[PDB]
Amino acid sequence: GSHHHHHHGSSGENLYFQSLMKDTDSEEEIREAFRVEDKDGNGYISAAELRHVMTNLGEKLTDEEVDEMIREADIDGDGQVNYEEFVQMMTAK
């Protein structure tokens, strides 16, 4: 009803990816979230931790999707998200 149209369609829907990098409550919440996601205090967000955020939102992606998602989302293609990159990834545009 309110949300549907799950068809791939011919539309690029590229702007969809930008939506993820957008939509934020408060800069403070993002900073705190990093700590919560950094349970190992490694100072880095891994797929496991990255999924925690997606799962919390109710979004469920496959194992292959996460790998490709992170790689495509990772600007430095380092396979890992850094603090400086994390903040920007959320504060992007």
Give the binding-site size for Ca ion (rule: CB under 5 A): 8
HEC secondary structure over 29-77 = HHHHHHHHHCCCCCCCECHHHHHHHHHHHCCCCCHHHHHHHHHHHCCCC
Which of residues 18, 42, 55, 88 is near Ca ion by CB under 5 A?
Answer: 42
Question: Minimum distance between the CB of residue 80 and Ca ion, rounded to whole angstroms?
Answer: 5
Among 24, 36, 76, 92, binds Ca ion (CB under 5 A): 76
CB of 90 to Ca ion, least distance (A): 13
